[PDB]
Amino acid sequence: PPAVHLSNGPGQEPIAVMTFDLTKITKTSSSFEVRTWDPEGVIFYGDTNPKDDWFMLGLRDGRPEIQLHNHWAQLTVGAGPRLDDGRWHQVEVKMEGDSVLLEVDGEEVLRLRQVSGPLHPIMRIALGGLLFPASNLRLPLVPALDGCLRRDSWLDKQAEISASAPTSLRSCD
Amino acid sequence: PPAVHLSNGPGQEPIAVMTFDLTKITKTSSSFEVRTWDPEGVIFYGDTNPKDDWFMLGLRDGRPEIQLHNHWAQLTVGAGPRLDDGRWHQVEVKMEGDSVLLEVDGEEVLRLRQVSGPLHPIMRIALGGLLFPASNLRLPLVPALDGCLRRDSWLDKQAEISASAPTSLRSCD
Numbered sequence: 001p002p003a004v005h006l007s008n009g010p011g012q013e014p015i016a017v018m019t020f021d022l023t024k025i026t027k028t029s030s031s032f033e034v035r036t037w038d039p040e041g042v043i044f045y046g047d048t049n050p051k052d053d054w055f056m057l058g059l060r061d062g063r064p065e066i067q068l069h070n071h072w073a074q075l076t077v078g079a080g081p082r083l084d085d086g087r088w089h090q091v092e093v094k095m096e097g098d099s100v101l102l103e104v105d106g107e108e109v110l111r112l113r114q115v116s117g118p119l120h121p122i123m124r125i126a127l128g129g130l131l132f133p134a135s136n137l138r139l140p141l142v143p144a145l146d147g148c149l150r151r152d153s154w155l156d157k158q159a160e161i162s163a164s165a166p167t168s169l170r171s172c173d
Numbered sequence: 174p175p176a177v178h179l180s181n182g183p184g185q186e187p188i189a190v191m192t193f194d195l196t197k198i199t200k201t202s203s204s205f206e207v208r209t210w211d212p213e214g215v216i217f218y219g220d221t222n223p224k225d226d227w228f229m230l231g232l233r234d235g236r237p238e239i240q241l242h243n244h245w246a247q248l249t250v251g252a253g254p255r256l257d258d259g260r261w262h263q264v265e266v267k268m269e270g271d272s273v274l275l276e277v278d279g280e281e282v283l284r285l286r287q288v289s290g291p292l293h294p295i296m297r298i299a300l301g302g303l304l305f306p307a308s309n310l311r312l313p314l315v316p317a318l319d320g321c322l323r324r325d326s327w328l329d330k331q332a333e334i335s336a337s338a339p340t341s342l343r344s345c346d
């Protein structure tokens with residue numbers, strides 16, 4: 001399948017942004033495969049509000065890191081094996097009741113419990129970058145992620161309202 | 174080496190409690206090996222205050238779970254492979270700067286960042302149970318853990334003020 005570059009040159013902005021109708025979402029999970037040699041960066045960001053209702057999955061020292069900030073929880077957590085070995089890795093992020101689960105290469109490596117209540121009309125998903133300055137993170141990192149993404153599925157496509165790209169998407173071909 | 178049972182009959186109380194002089198602790202880590210077929214229970218608990226400054230490492234659905242509550246963070250997180258396969262597993266919990274790291278069988282499986290500041294004169298460590306009712310946890314579980322512990326090392330022995338046992342310790346021999 002066709003893979004895309006996760007950063008556009010400088011890596012100061014997402015390669016793509018998707019907007020969703022929260023009330024229409026039935027599928028509360030996302031999946032994709034990523035390949036990279038970069039130990040730090042944003043794989044994807046999501047929010048309903050950039051100020052007080054956001055989430056980020058990235059890499060720090062080659063391993064998955066999740067930062068999350070909402071009414072119920074505020075945290076910075078690293079988990080799972082290193083993924084900056086240049087191999088393709090299957091990744092799934094799911095909402096299971098009030099928790100968020102992260103599975104890597106078929107194995108559950110992290111479950112953040114009691115982090116989300118009810119389900120805020122819209123949710124945004126940005127790939128390879130944030131929708132606010134890096135300095136705004138609970139724990140800053142340099143967002144640029146030099147890697148490839150493919151076979152990605154984001155939430156509920158039927159609930160997708162729109163998709164934007166700062167610049168044209170570059171293939172990892 | 175000699176291994177001890179992690180629960181005393183009912184499993185309604187810790188098999189042992191150790192108290193430490195916080196100001197004297199230089200070694201901020203603990204290590205041990207555990208073997209069990211039980212998917213749920215408390216491996217160990219720690220606090221400086223049972224009300225607002227506590228930590229718990231246990232098992233839920235066979236996997237490590239950490240609950241933590243203090244000035245800086247409040248969370249319930251599961252991570253790592255299942256450990257209820259009846260095999261001996263090396264476990265290490267360490268303080269690295271402002272974070273808490275959990276390593277299993279030599280691999281880092283979880284890093285809770287930004288969870289602890291400065292370093293509250295005393296710290297208590299209870300094995301196989303809590304120092305408050307289970308219902309008081311952020312997320313309740315049944316504390317009784319049917320398993321064995323051996324080669325355990327808790328914080329800084331030189332900082333240990335005292336050690337108590339509700340009842341006599343039972344060997345897994």
Ligand SMILES: C#C[C@]1(O)CC[C@H]2[C@@H]3CCC4=CC(=O)CC[C@@H]4[C@H]3CC[C@@]21CC
Nearest residue numbers: 028029030046053054055070093094095
């Ligand atoms: C709504 C909401 C939120 O609270 C704010 C951003 C949301 C996350 C956005 C990214 C995401 C993509 C998925 O495929 C599964 C759930 C997660 C979401 C879980 C609920 C969150 C974070 C806990």
Ligand SMILES: C#C[C@]1(O)CC[C@H]2[C@@H]3CCC4=CC(=O)CC[C@@H]4[C@H]3CC[C@@]21CC
Nearest residue numbers: 201202203219226227228243266267268
């Ligand atoms: C002091 C303090 C605390 O905040 C309250 C209980 C403490 C924990 C008690 C158990 C423990 C044992 C170790 O070998 C490493 C650090 C951890 C401690 C980290 C700091 C904590 C939790 C974050």
Ligand SMILES: [Ca+2]
Nearest residue numbers: 038040041144
């Ligand atoms: Ca990078």
Ligand SMILES: [Ca+2]
Nearest residue numbers: 211213214317
């Ligand atoms: Ca049990």
Ligand SMILES: [Zn+2]
Nearest residue numbers: 049052053120
């Ligand atoms: Zn909100």
Ligand SMILES: [Zn+2]
Nearest residue numbers: 222225226293
């Ligand atoms: Zn305190």
